[PDB]
Write a protein that binds this ligand. Structure first.
Ligand SMILES: [Ca+2]
Lengths: 557, 206
């Protein structure tokens, strides 16, 4: 999920611009829901996942807001001490405490129902996995007991008219989510919201802690601690699930890292490239980042250094020369299935070989499997989410930085071999592999592009539509499931705010019993494909002027 | 009129609700959601509560069990009961709005029932505040803010320490799964501020 907020110091023909691209995969019907609310203190427009009462992506004519997953560490696991003689109890603060328990029955269509028990301690629900007669792990979420508060904080924030009223609600949202602000005067803001535990001294948050009591959290850190910035000197706020702030620790996920190699640099670059950006230029950053190969910029220098001394005819050399001439912006050929340039295939093969040779080689099995992914892995239907730099690649990146990396290389991923030699061996593998497949004329290589699928199953893998309702788009785009842009004080409009979004396939997922698809069942699909967008209306006059239908209800609570 | 809810849809079918009080506003919201995404919402309801097998069968039992093992419904119900009347009105209204439309759908299913219901062999029932809340709770929270691999991490570290020895092992874990990396591009620039907390990276809890 990405977002860029451009403030007054960097906005052209406007005072602030907000472009949000939440990334949850692609689904039919649409992942988000378009809604406008007017009354009882609210006056908003925008769209929101699963039609939550609170709009995650929207504005109220005075301010605008957005989110991207935070990925801060707000979950710890407690190793609970059990006793075979006291089933259902666990030792805590010197006493055998009774676990919470409940019976559940899974009713199964055309199947026999299944009954089982779920267990919970003072730290959280008990995991099913990793159980012994003496141990069980509890998943402790810092937001536990604050779920509803976050749902409402997300609702009430829509009534905010300034940074102070908005941060008051950001302080109540306990999940680990980055919130963004913008307003009609050109002010912009960012808060890495969420509840984060105040851990005991000596507690390494990447590893489990005993649940006997001595390691319980001291409580939760105060809002003061949450990374935030209002009107940054840079004039912009950019995020792609990267680190909020210097020294701020990431999620403990072994596959997740905030390091020198981060895809967000791709956005920072385009925003800094131009002193000021217009709304249309800000929007164009979607199309560019969505086509940008994310590894080229990270490894190109290393590739160049390794091949800089080879003779013209060396094929390893020509592969690298091919990458050098490339901007890393993938485009489809006329056939609608292959990419114009073979760069990503080259990088994919090479990178896969490097990880096998380095990181994978230094990690004991079967943990080595965790670092083998190049980050290009996909199926026929294309990626199920965003493309990122793989964890193995981020580790490899620090190694190739040598002394420029702040991470001590306790072990040499290159195991004593010159880096050039290993980089060359990998380039050799790449050449054998691709030349064998596509021939030895690089210039006529038509490698496969990624495609994109709006799946009929929701992110859970549960059908939310009939299979046949699945939609397809030839060009995979590493972009938001939905994209919305709010432009404050636009100089070419009669309104103090303009807003656009795209909810593909369409606003409605309705199909009549006879199979007649709603008029708004797929009217935003092509628009999504060509980086188009439609206006979001707010004022009564705009809504009235663009009305298609109307209905009045009269109800007594 | 305090009891009047106006629903106006734009050229893309996007609904705009106009209402005087909280309950009526979110009543209108739920009403249009039911009109627009009834099957999607029903299945999302089942996904977030672990009742998919009820309609899809045995291939989703494990799914259901995992969902239910990941939360404590009573605790969610208790947060809902603690809600002020104003906040409660958000969920009650939303639930009620959906129910109004759902009642009309179940009354004239030959014209209003989304085809997927016929196809999947079941009909939609009424929602309660809990149902509405769980849509958000089960997605945003139980899934998008519930990430950890600490047990796996301890296994990796344990294997690193076995392979490279203790001090070395610890060092390599901090190389593969660093706690922080100062060269990480951050949304807030170093000139603005830095995070003041320092953490242990030695697994000193053992
Ligand atoms: Ca943790």
């Amino acid at each position: 999920s990405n977002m860029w907020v451009i403030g007054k110091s960097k906005a052209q023909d406007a005072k602030a611009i907000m472009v949000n691209g939440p990334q949850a995969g692609w689904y039919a019907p649409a992942y988000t829901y378009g809604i406008g609310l007017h009354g009882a203190g609210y006056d908003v427009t925008g769209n929101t996942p699963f039609a939550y009462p609170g709009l995650v992506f929207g504005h109220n004519g005075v301010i605008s807001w957005g989110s991207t997953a935070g990925f801060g560490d707000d979950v710890d696991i407690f190793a609970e001490r059990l006793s075979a003689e006291k089933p259902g109890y666990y030792l805590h603060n010197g006493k055998w405490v009774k676990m919470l328990s409940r019976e559940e029955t899974i009713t199964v269509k055309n199947g026999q129902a299944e009954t089982f028990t779920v267990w919970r301690t003072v730290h959280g629900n008990i995991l099913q996995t990793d159980q012994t007669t003496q141990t069980a792990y509890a998943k402790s979420r810092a937001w536990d007991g604050k779920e509803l508060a976050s749902l409402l904080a997300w609702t009430h924030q829509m009534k905010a008219k300034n940074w102070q009223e908005w941060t008051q609600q950001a302080a109540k949202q306990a999940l680990t989510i980055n919130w963004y602000y913008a307003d009609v005067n050109g002010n912009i803001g960012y808060v890495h919201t969420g509840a984060y535990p105040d851990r005991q001294s000596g507690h390494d948050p990447r590893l489990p802690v005993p649940g006997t009591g001595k390691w319980d959290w001291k409580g939760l850190l105060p809002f003061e601690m949450n990374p935030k910035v209002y009107n940054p000197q840079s004039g912009y706020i950019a995020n792609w699930n990267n680190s909020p702030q210097k020294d701020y620790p990431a999620s403990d996920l072994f596959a997740f890292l905030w390091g020198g190699a981060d895809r967000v640099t791709e956005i920072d670059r385009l925003l800094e490239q131009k002193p000021r950006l217009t709304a249309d230029q800000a929007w164009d950053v979607i199309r560019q980042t969505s086509r940008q190969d994310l590894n080229l910029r990270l490894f190109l220098p290393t590739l160049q250094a390794a091949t800089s001394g080879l003779t013209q005819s060396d094929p390893r050399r020509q592969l690298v020369e091919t990458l050098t001439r490339w901007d890393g912006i993938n485009l489809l050929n006329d056939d609608g299935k292959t990419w114009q340039q073979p760069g990503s295939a080259i990088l994919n093969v090479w990178l896969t070989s490097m990880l096998k040779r380095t990181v994978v080689a230094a990690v004991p099995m079967p943990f080595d499997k965790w670092y083998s992914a190049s980050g290009y892995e996909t199926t026929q239907d294309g990626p199920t989410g965003s493309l990122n730099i793989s964890v193995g690649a981020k580790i490899l990146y620090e190694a190739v930085q040598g002394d420029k990396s702040p991470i001590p290389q306790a072990v040499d991923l290159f195991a004593g071999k010159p880096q050039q030699e290993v980089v060359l061996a990998a380039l050799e593998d790449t050449w054998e592999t691709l030349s064998k497949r596509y021939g030895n004329n690089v210039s006529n290589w038509k490698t496969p592009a990624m495609a994109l699928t709006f799946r009929a199953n929701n992110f859970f893998g549960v059908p939310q539509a009939a299979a046949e309702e699945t939609r397809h788009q030839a060009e995979y785009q590493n972009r938001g499931t939905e994209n919305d842009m709010i432009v404050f004080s636009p100089t070419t409009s009669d309104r103090p705010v303009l807003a656009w979004d795209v909810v593909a396939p369409g606003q409605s997922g309705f199909i009549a019993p006879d199979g007649t698809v709603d008029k708004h069942y797929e009217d935003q699909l092509k628009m999504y494909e060509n980086f188009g967008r439609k206006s979001l209306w707010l004022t009564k006059q705009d809504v009235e002027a663009h009305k298609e239908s109307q209905e009045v209800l009269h109800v007594q609570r | 009129s305090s009891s009047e809810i106006k629903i106006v849809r734009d050229e893309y079918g996007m609904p705009h609700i106009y209402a005087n009080d909280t309950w009526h506003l979110f009543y209108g919201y739920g009403y249009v959601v039911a009109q627009d995404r009834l099957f999607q919402m029903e299945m999302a309801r089942r996904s977030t509560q672990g009742t998919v097998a009820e309609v899809l069968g045995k291939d989703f039992v494990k799914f259901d069990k995992d969902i239910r093992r990941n939360y404590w419904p009573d605790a969610i119900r208790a947060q809902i009961a603690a809600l002020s009347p104003e906040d409660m009105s958000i969920l009650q209204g939303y639930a009620d709005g959906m129910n109004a439309w759902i009642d009309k759908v179940n009354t004239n299913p030959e014209t209003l029932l989304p085809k997927q219901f016929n196809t999947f062999g079941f009909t939609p029932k009424r929602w309660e505040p809990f149902d509405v809340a769980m849509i958000f709770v089960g997605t945003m929270a139980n899934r998008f803010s519930d990430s950890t691999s600490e047990i796996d991490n301890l296994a990796l570290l344990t294997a690193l320490k076995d392979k490279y020895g203790v001090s070395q092992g610890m060092a390599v874990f901090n190389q593969l799964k660093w706690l922080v990396n100062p060269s990480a591009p951050t949304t807030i620039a170093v000139q603005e501020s830095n995070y003041p907390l320092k953490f242990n990276q030695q697994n000193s809890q053992t």
